[PDB]
Amino acid sequence: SPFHLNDAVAIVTGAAAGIGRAIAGTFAKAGASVVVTDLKSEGAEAVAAAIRQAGGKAIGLECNVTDEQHREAVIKAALDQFGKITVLVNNAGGGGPKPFDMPMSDFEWAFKLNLFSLFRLSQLAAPHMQKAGGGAILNISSMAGENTNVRMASYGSSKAAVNHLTRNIAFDVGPMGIRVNAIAPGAIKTAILKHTPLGRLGEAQDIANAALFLCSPAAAWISGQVLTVSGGGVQE
Template sequence: MKPAELFDLSGKVAIITGGANGIGKGCSKMLAAFGASVVVADLKLEAAEATAEEIRKEGGKALALACNVTKDEELVALVDKTLAEYGQINILVNNVGGGGAGRESPATLTVEQFARTFELNVFSNWRLAQLCAPHMENAGYGSIINMSSMSSINKSPAISAYASSKAAINHMTANLAFDYGPAGIRVNAVGPGAVRTDALASVLTPEIEASMLAHTPLKRLGEAEDIAGAVLYFAAPISRWVSGQTLFVNGGGVQTLD
């Protein structure tokens, strides 16, 4: 394989959930920059369209679609609309997720909130992989990238629902690699450390940042592009014999809120 082909996504179609902002936006723009036709799926259509327009202005191909990943009919519609527009699916980035990191005290967290975190972070990923896999097999190229987190291996207070859901992502990824491998589909996960996003900004203080960096060999917090680079690696042909792995992207260290 020629060097220029190792990261070439020309002719490939990628779905990125939660693709309008933060890490998702970074992934959408990164994959488009390397030639993929990108479907920016997001709960907020206006935000998705803004990101898609940025990509188109930069010479890329992008389609914005509204999608609530906790509603099965919208996941089915996302796949159907992608196929109607582009005719195939090759890459799925299950980026969407959420939880009350640092705010999940078992004294106040309800069973419904705990279940909702798994519905958003785990169940939607599994279902969308199930929906996309047959089309990846038909296309002869498939890469599923799930978004994990350093919280999946860290231990901290008030984060039991989110952290356990991300730990489930790691193990689910490793097992789905066996299920989909015979079809030529690779399944991997990326586990970000602390990344400068709007979500982190809501809790970040100079004191918290200093504490995080004290245990981070590369003395800065992550940027969305840092995570998108790992997603690109898993999406591209260069990782064609890599599956079932979780790659932690964390500046070499640990960043927690406590």
């Protein structure tokens, strides 16, 4: 079945908890060797160890994705341990509502954290992906990227840039055998009836299932897409 990740090597960032942790565990059950990263060293190591106690292959390390030496260390740890890189899940990111008059450093930080970090990690991963014969990049974006609301100057615009980066670099890396897609997740457990047609909150496993599809051979001809996983909802 093409819905497995047999012989894959996947880097999953911001994976100590929630969506990132569920993607890491799901990818390992699907056959990937997983390089789990998180801003907190203990959080990444906890997830990698839980994957190993479940029978999977995984290592965990600290990675501030806004730090170039940390980014390079992750690439090198994946190659040193597992020999190649074929999947990259950019799940690290952050931000939220802020006033229009926010300090300029807050606005610029949203772009460093949500956008510059995953563009650079994609640059770093792409040549290894190419040498391995292809790969998949998955960006975890936000529904704010396509909505319009108050207090969204930095969060909405930086996530919109993530969506549009996804669509454009699909053109650049397609010739290297690399696909690039994004998921925008609705609200997940850790008002709904009127906003959410399917009438329930989402689960982290719902996001991870869509992530597995998009990173698997079953999606080998899908690139440049933003997939909203939100129970049919259009607003958060």
